[PDB]
C-alpha cells in the first residue's frame, strides 16, 4: 500500500495473507468470508503468462496477522487449503476480467483478530458503489512502486467515475471491475501495490454499521501514479458464482 498508514490492531480481522510454502514468501492478500472460506483474486493463483498455477499444497493462508514478517504466536492462525476454485470465465488472457477465486480451508477459530467480512447484497452494492464514496484497502504489499512495511497498511480511497477509469488506461474495462483512487487535482494520494493484490476493498455500511467487501485488489499500472487508478473485482457482480461454489462444496 502506497501512502497509507499502519493498521490498528484488529482493524481488518478478515485480512488474510496468502503465503507460499517454499520459498516462504508473501504472495497476495485475501479475505475471510466464513470459518472455512477465503476470497482472493484469481490471478494470485493462476496466471499462465508468468508460469503461475498454484496447487493447494503449494500454499498456506495466515489469518489474524498484523506484522508482515513475524510469526505472531498465539494470535495468527495458519490454515492449509482443501481446494481452490477459480472463476470459470476468469480472463487471464486479456484483462483479468472476473478476477476472483475461493479457497476452502479445517475451520479457523474466530477471535479478536480473526472475524469474517460480509459480502454485499444488491441493495448495499447499489447504494455504496458510487463515484466519490470511499472504501478501504489493506495489505502488506510494497510501500512504493520503486520499501516494505513492518505491519499491515491501510488506505481509504474514493470510487472513481467509470468514464474516468476507462479513460485512464488502454486496457478494456468491464462491468466486473471498478476503479478507485484520487485524481491528480485532488491532492491526496494512495494505492495498492505489489503484494496487495487479492486483498479486500471494504466499505462500512452507514445503514447497519457492518463492513462489506465490495472489491478485490485486482490490477493497476504501476502504483500511485498520477492519472492512474487501481482496479478492483466487482464482488457483488460475481456473487452468484461465489454462492454456487459455497452451496455446492461448502
Amino acid at each position: 500500500i502506497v501512502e497509507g498508514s499502519d493498521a490498528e490492531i484488529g482493524m481488518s480481522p478478515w485480512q488474510v495473507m496468502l503465503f507460499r510454502k517454499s520459498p516462504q514468501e508473501l504472495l497476495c492478500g485475501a479475505s475471510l468470508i466464513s470459518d472455512r472460506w477465503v476470497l482472493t483474486a484469481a490471478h494470485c493463483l493462476l496466471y499462465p503468462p508468468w508460469d503461475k498455477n498454484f496447487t493447494e499444497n503449494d500454499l498456506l493462508v495466515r489469518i489474524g496477522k498484523h506484522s508482515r514478517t513475524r510469526y505472531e504466536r498465539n494470535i495468527e492462525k495458519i490454515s492449509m487449503l482443501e481446494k481452490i476454485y477459480i472463476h470459470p470465465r476468469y480472463n487471464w488472457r486479456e484483462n483479468l476480467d472476473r478476477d476472483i477465486a475461493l479457497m476452502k480451508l479445517k475451520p479457523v477459530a474466530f477471535s479478536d483478530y480473526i472475524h469474517p467480512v460480509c459480502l454485499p447484497d444488491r441493495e448495499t452494492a447499489a447504494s455504496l458503489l458510487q463515484a466519490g464514496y470511499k472504501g478501504r484497502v489493506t495489505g502488506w504489499g510494497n510501500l512504493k512502486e520503486t520499501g516494505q512495511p513492518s505491519v499491515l497498511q491501510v488506505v481509504n480511497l474514493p470510487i472513481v467515475e467509470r468514464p474516468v477509469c476507462k479513460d485512464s488506461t488502454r486496457i478494456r474495462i468491464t462491468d466486473n471491475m471498478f476503479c478507485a483512487g484520487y485524481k491528480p487535482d485532488e491532492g491526496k494520494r494512495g494505492d495498492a501495490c505489489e503484494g496487495d493484490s487479492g486483498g479486500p476493498f471494504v466499505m462500512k455500511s452507514p445503514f447497519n454499521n457492518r463492513w462489506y467487501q465490495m472489491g478485490i485488489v485486482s490490477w493497476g499500472e504501476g502504483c500511485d501514479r498520477d492519472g492512474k487508478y487501481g482496479f478492483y473485482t466487482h464482488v457483488f457482480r460475481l456473487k452468484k458464482w461465489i454462492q454456487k461454489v459455497i452451496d455446492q462444496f461448502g
Binding site: 466519490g132 462500512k204 452507514p206 457492518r210
Partner: peptide, 28 residues
C-alpha cells in the same frame, strides 16, 4: 455469517477506528 462485518475490537465494543469517519463522510 449473522455476525459478519462487526469487528470484535471496534463495532462489538462501540469503538471507532481512526479513519472510518472519512468513509462515512464520503457517503453523501
Amino acid at each position: 455469517e449473522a455476525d459478519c462485518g462487526l469487528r470484535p475490537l471496534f463495532e462489538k465494543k462501540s469503538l471507532e477506528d481512526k479513519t472510518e469517519r472519512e468513509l462515512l463522510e464520503s457517503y453523501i
